[PDB]
C-alpha cells in the first residue's frame, strides 16, 4: 500500500504535455509574448491533464535515447501544426503589405532596400484585422482538437516517418504568395491604372508631374478603394483557414 | 476530520498554489494581456513600468473579484473558521461561486470543445459541468476575450501612423520616419479622451456584463 | 533503464540490510523462547543472488526468497535456543551501522546527479 | 482512481491512525482496563513515523510543482 | 462578436482615418496641380518651386480644420473605447 | 495594548519587501521615470544616457521632492514610535496623514471618482474619508495621465527642428538625404544651450 | 465587507495575545502568587511558540507569492 | 482556538496529575497527624468534570489508635504510579507539540 | 507491503527523472527561439 | 563507458550548441540566405515575416537532412541499443554521415586554405579531414553557392524591372517611378510561373 | 566608537554592492560611454564596435583618469585604515574628501544651486561644506550636459562629409542616389586619417 | 610560496569569467568581427549572413591565428602546471609574455606613447618591461584603427560598381531608376567570381602577420 | 532634515556599542573582576547576537530591494 | 587540441567516480583490507571533481552565449 | 601608482599565507609535536575559514559589479 507508483504517472503526462506546450508556443494567438509565460504552461497542463488518462501510457525511460526521439517527435509535431496555421497570417501580412507599398506609403524601400526605414502600416492593420477574425471563427479551438486528434493517426509511441510529407508544408510557402497576389489583385490593378493614368499625364508638357501631383492623389485613392474592399478579406479569411485545415489534415496523415 | 497536524499541512501546502489560482482562476489574466498588447500599442514597450501595471492589475482584480470573496467568505470561511463546517467541506463549499463566475464569463464553443476531448457524457445543464472541464474553458474564453479587446484597441493608434505617413508622404518626404512623429501624436490622444480612466471603465464593464 | 541501473546495486544493498535487520530483531524478540534456532542470512550470496536474479517471494503471508540459515550455537542451553545475545547484539549494530553507511552512499549519488541536473 | 483521490486517501489514512493513537492513549490516560503502555507507545511511535512520511511526501511534491513551474515556455 | 461587426469595425475605423487625412492630402494636390499648371503655361520647370506651396498650404490646413480632425478623432475613440464591453466574445 | 515584540519584528522586516512597490506607486518616482524616458525617446537616440544614471537620478529627485512629507512623517511618527511612546499601529496610521496629504494634492477627481465607484463606495463625505486601497489606484492614474501630459509637450522642441530641417533639406532639392541623421546634432545643440536637463529638473520639481 | 488586511490584523493580534498572556502567566509564576503550575506555563509558551511559527511560515508563503506575481513581466 | 481544543486533554490530564500528586504528598507529610483523614480525588471523575476539584476519603484499612488513617504501603504506591502516569503526560504532550512543530518547519 | 526504502528510492528517481526532461526540453526550447529569433 | 552522470553533463552541454549545429553543419545557412535574397529581389523587405521563412529553411533542412538522419539512425540509434557499438566507437560513426555530407558540399579551395591556415601538412586523403578544417571551410562553400543561388535568383528581376523601366522610357515618360509599375508585375509572374515550388526543388537539387 | 569587525565587514561588503553606482555616478565612465555612443552614432555604423570593447575602453579610460583621485585616497584615507591607524567611519570621512574635490571640479554652478534651493538647504559658505546628497545629482547633470555638448561638437566633421557628397550628387543629377552608401566609406576614411580613436581619447582625457 | 587549492581553485574559476573580455582585447577576435561587419555593409545587404554565422567564422578564423600563441603558452606554461613543476603565480606571470609579444606586435606607437603618458609611467627602457594595463587600451586602439583601414579599403569594388551603375543610368537618361536595387546583383556577382569569402579571409590573415 | 544615511549609521553604531558592551563585559569577566556574573555576560551576548542579526536581515532587505528598483528597464 | 583536453578532464572525472563506487561496492559486500574512513574520503573527492567540472562547464557555457549574443 | 591588480594580488597572497600556516600547525600536531596545543589548531584554521569565506564573498561581489557593468547597451 501508499505505492503512488510515480513513473508510471509522469510517463503518462510527459509526452502529451510536450506535444501541447509545443504547439503552444507556436499557434498563432497562443504562441503571442503578451501572454505570460506560467498561463501558457498553464493551460497546457490543464489539457494534458484533461487528455492523458485517456491514452495508452507509454513506458520508455526518460533516461534513454529513445526519450530523446519521443521528445523530438512532440516538438515537430507541435511546430508543424502551428506553422501550417501562421502561413495564412503570414499571407495577409504579404497582401497588406504590397498594398501599402503600392500606396508609396514606404518609397525608401526602392532605394535603400532593409535601411531600417520601413512602416508597414497597411500590413498591421490587416494582420490584427486576421487575427480578430481566427478569434471570431474560433480557429484555436479548432488547433487544440487538431492537436488532440493526430494522436490518433500518429499515436505518442515512435513510429516511422515519410518525406515529400514535409515538403509539402514547405510547399506551402507558395500559397503565402498565390493568395496574397489575389487579395492585391482586388485594388492593386485599378492602382495599376490610376499610375498609367498618370503616365498620360506625363506624356504631355514635360516634367511638372509625378512625385508633385501623382503620390497624394494615388494615395487617397489606395485608402478609399482599400476602404471599400475591406468587406471581402473575410471569406477569403475562411479561404485561407479552410486551406491551411484541410492541408494540415491531409498533410500530417 | 483529518488531525489538526493534517489540516495545518494542507493549509500551508494549499498557500503555495496563490499565483496560480490568480492567473488561471481570476480577472487577473485579461487585465494583463489587455495592459501588455496597450502599452505594445502606445509605442512606450517600458513605460509604465511593470511593477506599476501589475500593481494596478493587482488592485483592479481586487476590485472585481469582491462579491465572489465575499460569498467565499459568508458561506465557507466563516462556518470554517466557527468549527461548524469541516476542513474538507469549507473547500467545497468555496469552490463553487468562483466556479459560477469562471462559468458566466466563459463561451458555449469552449466548453462543448472540453466536453468532447474528454469523451465525459451528455451535459444536459450547466450543473453537470466539472471543474476539469470549466477550468480550461475559461481559460481559453479569458484569452480571447482579452485578446478581442486589445485587437479593437490597437485600432486607432495604428489609424493614426497610417495617417501621419500618408500626410508625410503627400508633401514627399518620404526620409521622414513616421514613427518618430506620431508617438508624441498617439501620447496626445492617450491623454485627451481620458485614456485611463475609459480603458478601467470599460473593463471593469466587460467584466460585469 | 540507465539511472536504475546505475543506482539498483546500492538499493539492492540497502533493502537486503532491512531485510536482515528484521530477521535479526526475530531473533532478539525469540531470545528467551524456548526450542528456538537462531536464524541469519549470509548477506554477500544472497545479494549476489538478487543482483543477478531479480527479489523473488515465496507467497504473497508473504516473505522474501533468501535462504534462512541456521547460526552455530556457541555453549548449550537446557530450554534448547541457539540465541546467544552478545552475537545478536554485535550483529544488530553491525548491520545498523552497514544500513546507515547505504543510506549515506545513495543519498550521496542522488545529490552527486541532482547536482548535474539543476541549473 | 485519480492522483488527488490518492493523495486525498493518504492523507486520509495518515489523519485515521493518528486518531486511532491518540484516542488510545486518551483511553489509557483515563484509566479504563485492557489498554497497556506498551501498545500507547507503538502506536504512538507508528503515527509519528506516518506523519514525518507525510511531510516529506508534501515537501518534494512541492518542490517538484515549483520546478515545473519554473520551466519557461 | 459577429464577423460582420468586425469588418465594419475595421471600415468604420478605416474611413475615419480617410476623413482625417481628406483634407490635407488634396488642399496638398490642389497646390501641386495649380503649380504645375501655372509652370506648363509659363514654360517653366525647376523640380524645387513645387515643393515650396506645399508645405504652406498643407500647415495652414491645420490652422483652419485642425479642431475639426481633433474633436472627430476623440469622438471616435470615445465611443470606441464606451462600446468596447459589449462587443466582447 | 500593544503588539508584542516579535510580532513587530516579524511585521517590520516583512513590509521592507513592498519598499520597491511603495517607491514606485506611491511617490513621484513613476512620474519622473516616466518623463526621463520619454525625452530619451524624443532626443533621437534611444539609450544615450545610460538606464543607471537615470535611474539613481530620479531616484535622488524623489527623495528631495519629498523631503518634506518624509519630515513631517518623522516627526508624527518615526520619533514618538521609537521613543516608546506610542504603538506600532497607531505610529502607522499617523504616519499615513502626510502621505495621505502628498497624494491627495496630486488625484485627479476623475480617477477618484471613478475608483469609488467600482469599489462600492456611496456617501463618501469629506476629502478625509478616501481609503488608502481607494486613494492609491486613482494616484497612480492620475500619475500616469500627468507623465503623458508632460511627455507629449516634451516632444515638440524636438519635432519642430525635425520638420523645419525635412522641409528645407527637401525645397532645397536634396530629398535623398535622412533627416534625422542631421537633425541629431541640432536636437543635441538645442538641449545644451537651452540648459535641458536643468530646466526639466525645475519643471519637474515645480510639478508638484 | 470582507478585509483583507482586517484579517491580518485579527490574526496578528490572536498571535500577540497569546504570546502576551504566556508572558503574564510567567510573570506571575516567578513573581511566586499562588495558583500557577509551571506545567500550565510550559504548555502555554510553546503554544505561542506554535502560534508564531504559524504567523511565520503564512508570512513566508505570501511574500514568496507576492513576489513571484510582481516579478512577472506583463 | 483550535490549537487549544486538541491539547486540551493532555494539559488537564497533566494538571490533575499534578494536583493528585500533591494531594498524595501531602497525606505522606501528615502521616504523624493524630486524627487526620487521608484525602484523595477520583482522577477519572475529575477529568470529566474539567474536560466538559472535590478530595475524596481513603477508605481505611487499619484501625490506629490516633484517629489517622493514612497508610504508608497504599499511598506509596499511588505516589509512584502518579509520578509516572506524570511523565507517560509529558511525554504525549512533547510528542504531539513535537509533532506540530516539524508540520511547520520548513 | 512496500516499504519506505523503496518508496523513497522510486520517489527520488521520478524526482531526478523529471528533473532532467524539464532541463532537456528548456535546451530544445532555448534553442528554437533563438534560431526563430534571427534575422535572415 | 564513463559515468553516467558525466554522460548526463556532457548531453545537456552539447544540447546548448544545436543552434551551431544547425547552422554551421547542416545547410539551413544556404536556405536563410536564398530567402533573404530572393525578398531583396522582389523589392518587399518585410512581405514574408522573417519567421515564416525561418520556419520554412527549417523544413526544407529537415527533409534535406532526412538521407543524413536515415544513416545516422542505422550506423548510430539502431546499434546503441543492440549494444554492438555505443558511445565512443558510435558517436563518430553517427557523425561519419555529416563528414560525408560536408565533405560533398565543400570546395577544395576552402579546404586547401583551412589546411595551410593550420600548418596540417600531411593530410594526403579526402576522408580524414578534420573537423576543425572542414567545418568553417564548409561554411564558406555555404556562403559562395547562396550567394551565386541569389543571383541566379536575382536575373529574372532586374530583367523585368529593366524591361518596364525602358518602355516607361520609350512611351515619353520621364519621371514615373518604374518600381511601383514593376512590383505587381514581378509577383504576377513569380506567381503564374509558381517560382515557389520550382525554387525549392532547384534547392533540393542543388543538395 | 570604532566599528566591531563584523560590522565593519558588513559595511564593507554593502559598499561593494554599490560599485556600479559609484563608477557610473562619482567617476568619468558616464561622459566617456555618452561620447562613445554619440560618435558610433555618428559615423553610420550603429554596431560595428561591439559594445563589450567600448566599455572596456571606457573603464580603462576611467582607471587612468581617476587614478591621481585613487591614490589620494590611498595615502590619505586606506593606508592609516589598513595599518590600523584610524576607524573606519574617519577613514572613509577622509577618502570622501578628494573624491568630493574632483567632482566640485567638474560642476556647474547653476545645477548645484538648484539642488541647493530644491533641497531647502541653509546658506553654505564656500565649497568646503556641501553635502554629498547634494553634490552628486549636480555632478551627474553636469556630466550629461558636458557629455551633449561634445557629442554634438563631434559630429560636426561626419555633418560636413555628408553634406558635400550630397550636394556633389546632387549637382551632377544623380537624384535617386542615396547619399550614405557613398558617405560611409568616406567617414571611415576621415576618422582613420586623423588619427581618430587616439586623438579622440586623448581629448576626452584633457576635459577632465 | 604556491597558492592554496582553494585559493587556485577560487582564482581560475573567477578568470573563467573574463573569457569574452579577454576574446575582444587580447585576441584578433575583435578585427574580424568588425570587418565583417562592414563587410556585410558593402554588399548592400545588412542582413547578409546571419549573425551567428559571422561571429563563429570569425570565432574559428581567431583560433586559427592564435594556434602559434596558443602552443607556445600550453609549451611554456600550461605543461608544467600540469606535470607540476610550476605554481599557479609563475604560470600567470610565464604564459602571458608570448600573448604580450603578439598584441605589442600589433600595437601602434602613438597608442602605447598615449596610454604611457596618460598614467604617468616612468622612462619604459624597452619593449619587454611594458606593462599589461598601458598595453591593453592602446593594442585595442590600434585593433580599432586598423579594422576600420581594411573596412574602407573594402568598401572600394563596390562603390566602383555603385558609381558606374548609376552613371549608366542616368546616361540613358532613366533618371527615376534607384541605382542600389540593379547594383546589389552585380555587388554579389563580384564578390562570387572573385572568390570574396576566401580571399578575405586570407587577407586577414596574412595582415595579422 | 531627514537622512537616510544618518539614521543608518546611527543604528549600525547602536549595534556596534552593543557588540563591544558585550565583548567588553566577557573581557571583565575572563579577568576575574568581581561584580559581573555569567548570566548577564551570556544574557548580553545572546542580545548582542540578536541585534547584529537584525542588522543583517534589514541589510538583506535593502540590498535587495535596491537591486529590484535599479534593474528596472527605462 | 581543446576538445582533447576537454576529454582527458571528463575521463579523469569520471574514472575519480568509478574508482569511488567500485570502491563502496566492494566495502559493501564485506570485502577486507578497504576502510570506511578511505571510502568516505574517495567519494566526498570524487564529489568536489565533479562539482568542478559542472562549474567549469557553467563558466564556459556563459562564456560562449555571452560571444554568440554579440551584434557583429 | 596604485593598482587594484596588486591589492588583489596581495589578498590573495594573504588569504593563502592563512591558510597554509593553519594547515603546517596542524600536520604538524598530528605528528605529535609537543608545542603544539588542539585549541590553537582549531582557532586558526577556523580564523582561515574566515578569511577565506570574506576573499569569496568579495570575489562575488566584485563578479557582479563586473557582469552588471559590461552587459550595458553604451
Redesign the interface.
Known sequence: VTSEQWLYWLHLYFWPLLRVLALISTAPILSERAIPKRVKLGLGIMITLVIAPSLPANDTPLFSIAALWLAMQQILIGIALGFTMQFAFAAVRTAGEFIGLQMGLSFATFVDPGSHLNMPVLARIMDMLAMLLFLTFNGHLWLISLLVDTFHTLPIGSNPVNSNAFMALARAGGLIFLNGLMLALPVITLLLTLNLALGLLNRMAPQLSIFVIGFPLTLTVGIMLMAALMPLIAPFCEHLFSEIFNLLADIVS | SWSLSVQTLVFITSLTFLPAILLMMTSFTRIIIVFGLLRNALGTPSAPPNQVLLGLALFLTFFIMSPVIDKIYVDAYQPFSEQKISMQEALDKGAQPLRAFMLRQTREADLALFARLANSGPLQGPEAVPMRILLPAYVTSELKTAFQIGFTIFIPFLIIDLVIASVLMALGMMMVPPATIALPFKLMLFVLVDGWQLLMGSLAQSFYS | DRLDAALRFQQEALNLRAQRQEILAANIANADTPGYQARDIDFASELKKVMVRGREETGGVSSPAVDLLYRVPDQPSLDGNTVDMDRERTQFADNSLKYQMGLTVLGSQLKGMMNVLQG | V??AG?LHA??????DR??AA?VQ??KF???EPGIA?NDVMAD?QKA?VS???????????????????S??? | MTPESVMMMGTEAMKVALALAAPLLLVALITGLIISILQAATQINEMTLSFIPKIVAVFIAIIVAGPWMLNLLLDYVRTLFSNLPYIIG
Open positions: 485519480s492522483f490518492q493518504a492523507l486520509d489514512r495518515i489523519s493518528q486518531a491518540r492513549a486518551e490516560t483515563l484509566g503502555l504512538m509519528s506523519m514525518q512520511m507525510g511531510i516529506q511526501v508534501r515537501n518534494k511534491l512541492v518542490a517538484a510543482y515549483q520546478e515545473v513551474m520551466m519557461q515556455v
